[PDB]
Amino acid sequence: GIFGAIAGFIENGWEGMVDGWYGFRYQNSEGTGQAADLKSTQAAIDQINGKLNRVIERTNEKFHQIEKEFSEVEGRIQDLEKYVEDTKIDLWSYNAELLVALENQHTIDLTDAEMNKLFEKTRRQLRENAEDMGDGCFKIYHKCDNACIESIRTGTYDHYIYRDEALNNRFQSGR
Amino acid sequence: GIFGAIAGFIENGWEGMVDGWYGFRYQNSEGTGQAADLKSTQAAIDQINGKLNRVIERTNEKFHQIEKEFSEVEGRIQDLEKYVEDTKIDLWSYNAELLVALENQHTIDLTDAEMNKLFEKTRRQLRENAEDMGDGCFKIYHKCDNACIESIRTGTYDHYIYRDEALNNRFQSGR
Amino acid sequence: GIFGAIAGFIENGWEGMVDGWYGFRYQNSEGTGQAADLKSTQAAIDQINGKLNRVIERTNEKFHQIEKEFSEVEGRIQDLEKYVEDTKIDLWSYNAELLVALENQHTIDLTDAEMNKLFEKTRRQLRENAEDMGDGCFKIYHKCDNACIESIRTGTYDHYIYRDEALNNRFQSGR
Amino acid sequence: NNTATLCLGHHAVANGTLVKTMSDDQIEVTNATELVQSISMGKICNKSYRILDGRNCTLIDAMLGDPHCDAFQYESWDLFIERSNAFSNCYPYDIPDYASLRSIVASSGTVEFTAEGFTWTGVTQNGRSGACKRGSADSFFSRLNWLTKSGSSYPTLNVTMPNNKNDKLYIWGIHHPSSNQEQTKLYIQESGRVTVSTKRSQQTIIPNIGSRPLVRGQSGRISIYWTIVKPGDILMINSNGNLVAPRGYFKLNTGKSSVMRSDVPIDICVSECITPNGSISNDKPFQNVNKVTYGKCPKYIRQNTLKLATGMRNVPEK
Amino acid sequence: NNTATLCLGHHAVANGTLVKTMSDDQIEVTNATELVQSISMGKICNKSYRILDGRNCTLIDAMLGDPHCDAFQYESWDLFIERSNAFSNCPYDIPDYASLRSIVASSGTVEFTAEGFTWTGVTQNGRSGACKRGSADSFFSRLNWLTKSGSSYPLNVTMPNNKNFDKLYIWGIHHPSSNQEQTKLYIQESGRVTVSTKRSQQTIIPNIGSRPLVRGQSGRISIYWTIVKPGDILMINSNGNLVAPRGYFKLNTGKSSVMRSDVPIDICVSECITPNGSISNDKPFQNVNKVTYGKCPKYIRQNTLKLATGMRNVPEK
Amino acid sequence: NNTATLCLGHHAVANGTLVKTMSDDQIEVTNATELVQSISMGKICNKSYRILDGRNCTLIDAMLGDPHCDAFQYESWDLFIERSNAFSNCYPYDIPDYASLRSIVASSGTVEFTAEGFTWTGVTQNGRSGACKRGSADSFFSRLNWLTKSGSSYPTLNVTMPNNKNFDKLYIWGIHHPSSNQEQTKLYIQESGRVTVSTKRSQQTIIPNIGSRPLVRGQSGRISIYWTIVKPGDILMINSNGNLVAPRGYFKLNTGKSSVMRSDVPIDICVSECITPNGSISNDKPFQNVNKVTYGKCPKYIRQNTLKLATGMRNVPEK
Ligand SMILES: *[C@@H]1O[C@H](CO)[C@@H](O[C@@H]2O[C@H](CO)[C@@H](O[C@@H]3O[C@H](CO[C@H]4O[C@H](CO)[C@@H](O)[C@H](O)[C@@H]4O)[C@@H](O)[C@H](O[C@H]4O[C@H](CO)[C@@H](O)[C@H](O)[C@@H]4O)[C@@H]3O)[C@H](O)[C@H]2NC(C)=O)[C@H](O)[C@H]1NC(C)=O
Ligand SMILES: *[C@@H]1O[C@H](CO)[C@@H](O[C@@H]2O[C@H](CO)[C@@H](O[C@@H]3O[C@H](CO[C@H]4O[C@H](CO)[C@@H](O)[C@H](O)[C@@H]4O)[C@@H](O)[C@H](O[C@H]4O[C@H](CO)[C@@H](O)[C@H](O)[C@@H]4O)[C@@H]3O)[C@H](O)[C@H]2NC(C)=O)[C@H](O)[C@H]1NC(C)=O
Ligand SMILES: *[C@@H]1O[C@H](CO)[C@@H](O[C@@H]2O[C@H](CO)[C@@H](O[C@@H]3O[C@H](CO[C@H]4O[C@H](CO)[C@@H](O)[C@H](O)[C@@H]4O)[C@@H](O)[C@H](O[C@H]4O[C@H](CO)[C@@H](O)[C@H](O)[C@@H]4O)[C@@H]3O)[C@H](O)[C@H]2NC(C)=O)[C@H](O)[C@H]1NC(C)=O
Ligand SMILES: CC(=O)N[C@@H]1[C@@H](O)[C@H](O[C@@H]2O[C@H](CO)[C@H](O)[C@H](O[C@]3(C(=O)O)C[C@H](O)[C@@H](NC(C)=O)[C@H]([C@H](O)[C@H](O)CO)O3)[C@H]2O)[C@@H](CO)O[C@H]1O
Ligand SMILES: CC(=O)N[C@@H]1[C@@H](O)[C@H](O[C@@H]2O[C@H](CO)[C@H](O)[C@H](O[C@]3(C(=O)O)C[C@H](O)[C@@H](NC(C)=O)[C@H]([C@H](O)[C@H](O)CO)O3)[C@H]2O)[C@@H](CO)O[C@H]1O
Ligand SMILES: CC(=O)N[C@@H]1[C@@H](O)[C@H](O[C@@H]2O[C@H](CO)[C@H](O)[C@H](O[C@]3(C(=O)O)C[C@H](O)[C@@H](NC(C)=O)[C@H]([C@H](O)[C@H](O)CO)O3)[C@H]2O)[C@@H](CO)O[C@H]1O
Ligand SMILES: *[C@@H]1O[C@H](CO)[C@@H](O[C@@H]2O[C@H](CO)[C@@H](O[C@@H]3O[C@H](CO)[C@@H](O)[C@H](O)[C@@H]3O)[C@H](O)[C@H]2NC(C)=O)[C@H](O)[C@H]1NC(C)=O
């Protein structure tokens, strides 16, 4: 994908995540855990559902038309009837091919986009207190329980409360 | 959209910005202020202008064609004339519907892109002297007057000049 | 394009890179140098090769059709024969115009994306040890010889090894 | 510890599926759906639309009144099914522009007939033939009236018929005899003629005498022509011999009606789209079953499979 | 303060409008434009194109020379407007009427050039009470009804095409009502018309019989055409029933056509015409009518399509 | 130093090229390719498909057996090229619905003829004309049989021919239009002839029309040509009391890839899988702006003469 998240900086998918399409795994003082992010999952699915109804109108009713199969050889008018159908089928055949490729591209690209957006959303919350590992993982520089992780996932995490603790832990170092 | 700037980390649009499409609001030692960014505004406008002309050739003169209404029942030939016209109208109808969806998706994505590009542009100048607030806002850790704000949105800002002041303000805390 | 890398924060292309499509230039304790990144280059080429074969199926064998040029004027039947052919040509001509605008937009966007993807990849490796100069360039706050730089290009670079050294060089300053 | 590690990710499935994009020929996604209907139902569903099984009868024969088609006498349809083992079993005929009249009748959607009191003074009516058996006896098309000389006369027939209704379709014909001896024997005059006219149009057909290959023991032929009389207009028929006369008219409807060639059986099910291969499902935008369709149908295309991705790229473990 | 804040953003409007994308059925943008013309001007504009109001006359009647269509005698057009009130007033049929109409429509003129045909032994200028010019019996002005002169009806007349263009010859045959009428008008019991060139021929036989009275007449005339190529010659052979041509029509290659409409012509300017009247030109698509002439938008099924000309509109809480 | 700078970038070229996107009317990329074939080969290539030069002969002339078309008697083709210069040189004729027969024969891809033993009792056969010279002497179409009165009789001809093969037969026949009533009674006995050609399922009757026509190649009389397709199991019947121009046999109809094309361009040893009236063209492009008339494996004809597909990133050189 164009964002390089899915099959990019995020190495692989999680088969053990069945509650949603995008989500979280974490390790802290209360062990490890997993949670889905429903807002991201919904944003993807809403775009994917009815995808085709935006382009193709509900199947057309059609009744009497032209003859498309012939038992006798007639010359001129049969040539015309044949050519018209040939032209129609080929133009729709093209439409269908293009549409599939166009929409599939769109799908790959928007799903990849949502992964990146959730990552970015999380990064902006953590401010100075965390570290992007490139794994798609954050290293948080303070004790963060399940109530604390929960607050990140909802978007209520106040970074000022841990800033001092995070600065201590981060700057422990120097040669 | 895909970048999640418009209706994303930037919470809403400004109804009181009439100079441009994209821009800045700021609070400093001289109060509050507003200024549009013209390159972004133009970058987007230039892509939206004559959008349709890049795909559909300027409408062409047609003259004597076929008959499309009939006041007599005829059979073979009239079936053909009706089918041909019906085939045509459905194909152009498909075209019109697909084109509008494509172009509008393009418009939404490119306008979101412009917002995001401007954000990144602004970020890259501030370096360590500032802090992404996640709001689409920057916390600048030094006294920055109107001329200094102008310095940022003209892209003539020198971060080295304010680096030492910025570090002092930034690392005041930790407990 | 949409990522603002090519003709964006990266000032211009390198005419002196015949080696690949994307890559690195560097100055260190062993002089200056240049190398291409083959993974990015290949990723772009793979999307651009056979691009048209994904949409428009290979040219098809067609034999006897309708007459498309006439000596005598005839009226009704010839009117129809011309209209059919006129209709077909206008519709293919539209498909072609749209397809070229479409594929070209895609080609600009994906090549722009690969540049951004490589920058981001490099940024995520260097962690705190480096600075985004806003140039497409990284200020690496430690002694990095050719082997050290290759480890960045291979993606084997361990930031922990150099962290202590980087913190010293970085925080030499303050007023 | 004194720190935490929070990782972001996405889901994946065990067995994923391949789709095509603008970037890749083949790429694995978590889930996709078929967009091309390639399987039919094997039969024609009798429900939703009104289906009339033609059985042994062509539409044209059902409307002419071929004896073995008498069961179709009062019938109307949304779709008339013509079977390939249908046959004619009446007097040998030809219709110049057969294809167009078949289309007109098909579109009207009925062979229901309305008798009119034509007076044929000086000629004998209800001409019969051994080629056209009504179960056992010699007969003729029910909707056609074969006129011959009465006693020893065939007066120039001059009959009229106004259209006071708010379009009537008239079917009629001319008989081509086999020899000159036959021509005079049946309609005194050595040369016949039929002129059917209205205020706005006219047609004249001269009969052609000669031997033609025996069909059900007959070498003569009937030629069938049609006329459309508008409201306020008036049908006129002038003839001095050889007239195969109309018995009334067919009402012309603007309809959703058509005709289809198929040998697939008719069965009890529900569908909204019919092809020569029987009914098809309706839920996909495209279809590869047959270019010949009737009803609410997916667009016919050359390709037999097209997969629309409905999930993100599938990236399995390692 | 000792610090500063700088926030980035984009504009919004109060008058937002909904469009369709690939991602959403309906999303608000700051601005959109209509791509489908659905409003007509309500009238046909006289300017840009040369419009001929047919009034009481069909194109065919006007070229045949039906007396009440005399005013069209010399007329040319870009577009000929056929009204539904139009009536015939001279009774005929034309096999392949639609084609001849098409050929003439496309040629864009009913301007006629008289030639000196010589018809030895027959009487010319047949008239009829079915075709009144002013007060007296008359006939199609472009056709010449030939009958018995004295007690005989001999015809083998030639006419070469020495010009550098095609000539269109309109001729006919008369179908009388009774055997009595045939011999009275043209001695021979059975007549014929053989119109030929070096490359083609047509023979028509008159069909005798009673038809319904049209304007007091039970007889009919059937009409036919022949195109003569440069260097070719027109030959007309007949021993009865011929409705002779009086000259030729010049076949043009032009932008000319014909259209059925009951909408009025008015002082106005547009580049596209429909049976509903002229329509505006600025939009790519149009839903007014599939029948068009000129520089027209493409006709489609949908009556509205909205092209986004601004970003996503995000007003405050 | 005590530091290092690592820069990222991309390549660029000197020979940039302008393309069209959805965002920009013209934008410079590193490389692009032409999607529209514009040049033809100036000639028609005869490898790939069997190409037949019609030369002086139209397709119809060739199948009727016009004397100057004799060399085509056994010819077959994938594509038959008709030239402008083609002329007819036999008895003056017309074919009602000429274009359809041309189309039917074109598709069949052959004018090979199979003779049949027709018996024409009581008439004289092999009628000849000065309007149709085979080398030196008067002649007639080699595939037709002009029948006239023998002695002072033209009996009502009643001839039959059964189709016992498994394919459709195409029969070509005609009728003679004399110039005067005097001529009509001199060649045939009756004052008015007729031809009825019938099967079990179809019939045609044509009445001849007497009268003078423009003199073509000496004659003012004419022949009109008609056709009949006889299905396997059916039976051709011909009935005539004068004026018949009888068939000498049948043509075999073939379901094939054959066609006919009008071109004045030379035929040359060459390979290409696509033919236009301007000559052969290349297949490698998706579109072409050479001709709407094509035969073979051809790109799609479109209005535009050039279309550039980008095959590289935006080209951004030094400023
Ligand atoms: C112009 O030329 C045609 C062709 O020759 C003539 O038409 C033929 O006329 C003959 C005799 O009148 C027809 O005779 C018929 O053929 C029978 C042979 O058996 C069967 O043939 C077919 C095919 O198998 C079957 O469908 C059919 O039912 C037959 O059973 C004859 O046996 C029959 O005639 C009679 O002969 C027997 C004695 O052998 C008697 O006992 C019977 O009474 C029987 O009726 C049978 O009807 C022949 O079919 C015609 N051919 C075609 C193609 O139609 C025209 O007569 C001639 N016209 C002229 C000169 O004006
Ligand atoms: C074959 O059969 C047809 C049909 O029957 C015959 O055609 C009819 O012939 C009769 C006379 O022979 C026609 O009747 C005459 O025509 C006029 C009818 O006009 C109608 O419309 C007008 C509107 O202008 C109305 O006013 C009127 O009521 C009618 O509805 C009348 O005007 C005629 O009257 C005149 O003639 C009589 C003598 O007959 C005089 O005494 C009067 O003073 C008056 O001037 C008259 O009624 C009838 O219209 C014809 N119908 C059609 C459909 O053509 C053929 O004659 C016949 N052919 C044969 C036997 O060869
Ligand atoms: C109905 O009306 C038509 C049209 O007028 C008549 O047809 C014309 O008939 C005349 C008389 O037969 C034809 O004239 C003859 O043409 C022959 C061919 O000449 C053509 O080619 C030469 C070049 O070789 C040109 O010079 C010339 O212009 C022609 O194009 C010639 O063989 C004749 O000339 C010879 O005859 C005289 C004696 O008559 C001899 O001394 C010489 O040998 C001389 O060479 C003559 O010129 C004319 O071509 C016909 N025109 C058309 C258009 O068909 C019908 O005859 C008439 N039918 C009736 C009354 O029933
Ligand atoms: C041994 C033998 O030949 N016996 C004859 C026998 O042929 C003949 O039968 C009649 O033959 C004539 C041929 O001129 C017709 O084919 C008759 O066919 C019928 C038919 O069945 O269609 C009879 C019918 O009653 C006729 N109907 C009318 C309305 O006229 C039709 C019709 O005339 C023709 O089809 C017109 O084309 O023909 C057939 O019976 C008999 C006759 O009595 O005489 C034996 O001696
Ligand atoms: C009630 C009564 O007794 N009426 C008759 C009346 O029929 C007759 O009028 C003539 O009737 C004849 C029919 O035999 C024609 O209808 C005549 O019509 C005209 C016409 O069309 O106007 C006259 C015209 O001069 C003719 N033109 C030519 C070139 O011949 C045409 C022409 O013959 C026909 O149109 C051909 O179809 O016919 C009409 O005058 C009168 C006069 O005799 O006597 C009354 O008593
Ligand atoms: C100057 C002059 O008076 N010359 C005549 C001259 O007319 C005549 O030549 C014959 O004229 C007749 C016309 O009545 C035909 O045109 C003859 O044409 C031929 C032909 O095609 O060459 C002869 C040929 O043998 C005929 N073939 C058959 C099968 O009948 C055909 C045929 O009849 C016609 O083509 C039918 O339309 O016509 C032509 O020879 C000469 C010699 O008779 O006498 C001069 O006095
Ligand atoms: C820029 O790209 C274009 C193509 O978009 C290059 O020109 C074309 O290159 C193709 C593929 O390499 C050539 O195709 C040839 O096909 C034959 C098979 O028939 C094969 O034998 C050859 O080996 C080759 O693959 C094609 O000749 C050529 N087309 C034209 C019109 O020149 C171009 O070289 C690229 N330029 C750069 C700087 O990359």
Ligand SMILES: *[C@H]1O[C@H](CO)[C@@H](O[C@@H]2O[C@H](CO)[C@@H](O[C@@H]3O[C@H](CO)[C@@H](O)[C@H](O)[C@@H]3O)[C@H](O)[C@H]2NC(C)=O)[C@H](O)[C@H]1NC(C)=O
């Ligand atoms: C957003 O909505 C529409 C469409 O984007 C804008 O209105 C249109 O703007 C065009 C600019 O090209 C105007 O065209 C004008 O044409 C006249 C001649 O008729 C000429 O004199 C002008 O110089 C100009 O070229 C036009 O006003 C208008 N077109 C329409 C309505 O069809 C609108 O301005 C935009 N609104 C906002 C708030 O930005």
Ligand SMILES: *[C@@H]1O[C@H](CO)[C@@H](O[C@@H]2O[C@H](CO)[C@@H](O)[C@H](O)[C@H]2NC(C)=O)[C@H](O)[C@H]1NC(C)=O
């Ligand atoms: C994969 O996607 C398909 C198609 O979208 C799913 O089937 C649809 O599920 C929806 C959701 O309730 C139903 O309303 C539809 O009836 C189904 N669509 C069609 C076209 O039949 C399918 O369930 C998904 N499969 C998996 C394993 O997730």
Ligand SMILES: *[C@@H]1O[C@H](CO)[C@@H](O[C@@H]2O[C@H](CO)[C@@H](O)[C@H](O)[C@H]2NC(C)=O)[C@H](O)[C@H]1NC(C)=O
């Ligand atoms: C269609 O025609 C066939 C054959 O002509 C009819 O089948 C015959 O029916 C009778 C009884 O009605 C049987 O005695 C025969 O054995 C059948 N013949 C054959 C060959 O099967 C059949 O009746 C017709 N179909 C309909 C629906 O009427």
Ligand SMILES: *[C@@H]1O[C@H](CO)[C@@H](O[C@@H]2O[C@H](CO)[C@@H](O)[C@H](O)[C@H]2NC(C)=O)[C@H](O)[C@H]1NC(C)=O
């Ligand atoms: C077209 O025909 C109409 C109707 O036949 C003509 O209008 C009539 O004109 C006369 C004057 O001669 C009036 O007395 C009538 O009242 C009108 N008739 C009707 C039914 O309204 C009109 O003259 C013709 N049009 C043109 C342009 O000449």
Ligand SMILES: *[C@@H]1O[C@H](CO)[C@@H](O[C@@H]2O[C@H](CO)[C@@H](O)[C@H](O)[C@H]2NC(C)=O)[C@H](O)[C@H]1NC(C)=O
């Ligand atoms: C086609 O016909 C033309 C003209 O009839 C032929 O050209 C003639 O060639 C022969 C020599 O064989 C001579 O009679 C003349 O010198 C030529 N006549 C003219 C008018 O140029 C040509 O040979 C024919 N072409 C083919 C391929 O058979």
Ligand SMILES: *[C@@H]1O[C@H](CO)[C@@H](O)[C@H](O)[C@H]1NC(C)=O
């Ligand atoms: C409000 O909305 C439309 C966008 O559809 C805009 O063009 C217009 O200028 C706005 N203001 C008005 C109509 O006063």
Ligand SMILES: *[C@@H]1O[C@H](CO)[C@@H](O)[C@H](O)[C@H]1NC(C)=O
């Ligand atoms: C651009 O220049 C190079 C080097 O000379 C050449 O090989 C290449 O084919 C050129 N690109 C084209 C013709 O598209």
